[PDB]
Design a protein around this ligand. Structure first.
Ligand SMILES: [Cu+2]
Ligand SMILES: [Cu+2]
Lengths: 159, 159
């Protein structure tokens, strides 16, 4: 393995939205995220433009400036935690991600088991990103905030 | 209208950096930039990854989360103005831009003539953008702040 897919990707609002996890990843700038040593997985959202995206993004481009909150629930134990993914880059391109404590989680209940993952996604305007709205070069309005849901079995840190 | 290219594009720091100007463009959300009614041009920086970008960006992808300031100098009159370009999207894709008063600027001296344009560019870390630095998927350091220079003749608002 190396990279473990979470559920099936969704296509909505002119974007493909997939979720994957890796082993914990050391990040810079130092302190921008939970330390790899204190985590068990690195959760990623992969979000790219589809064909005929309605907001001016060419097919395949990364969708930047999104706000992505997450909710991770172990449905066996009831354990719930929430956070936000941050924009970042790996050698294979930009994405949104976060290091997450699972077995290391202090309240516990985030071990091996069945999970529900929710991403809550809001458009780039929230982060100061503009749209041309003239007749010749303008683009359509952005989507309203929305959620996408996945189910997956967590088997431990990929190795 | 139509786009007027400014000088020659430059290749540095994993990126191609080009400049163009168009007619003023109304921007949304309203108030995010100078009103089209008060400008003479809309200045764009078009910045995309080169091959083998050292920070992991695929060739041709837009370079996001950059901090970009401009300085425009009329070399005939000596007038200098400065400002920031903001991230935004048009029908052809994401870019950095700003509506700019030229003939309309009440200070005067920003009329038709010979100009030098400088972009001052700082890396995404300054805006909270992260990088993987693990052995498997990690990428190298970002560039230090830099400038790029162009010379062009401003012929008036594009027609
Ligand atoms: Cu990541
Ligand atoms: Cu623009």
């Amino acid at each position: 393995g190396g990279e473990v897919p979470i559920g099936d990707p969704k296509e909505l609002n002119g974007m493909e939205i997939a979720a994957v996890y890796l082993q914990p990843i050391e990040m810079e700038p130092r302190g921008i995220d939970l330390a790899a040593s204190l985590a068990d997985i690195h959760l990623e959202a992969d979000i790219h433009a589809l064909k005929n995206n309605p907001n001016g993004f060419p097919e395949g481009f990364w969708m930047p400036y999104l706000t992505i909150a997450y909710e991770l629930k172990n449905t066996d134990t009831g354990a719930i935690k929430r956070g936000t993914l941050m924009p970042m880059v790996a050698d294979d391109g930009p994405h949104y991600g976060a290091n997450i404590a699972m077995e290391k989680d202090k309240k516990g209940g985030f071990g091996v088991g069945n999970y529900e993952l929710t991403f809550y996604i809001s458009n780039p305007e929230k982060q100061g990103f503009g749209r041309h709205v003239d007749e010749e070069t303008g683009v359509g309005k952005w989507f309203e905030p929305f959620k996408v849901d996945y189910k997956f079995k967590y088997t431990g840190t990929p190795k």
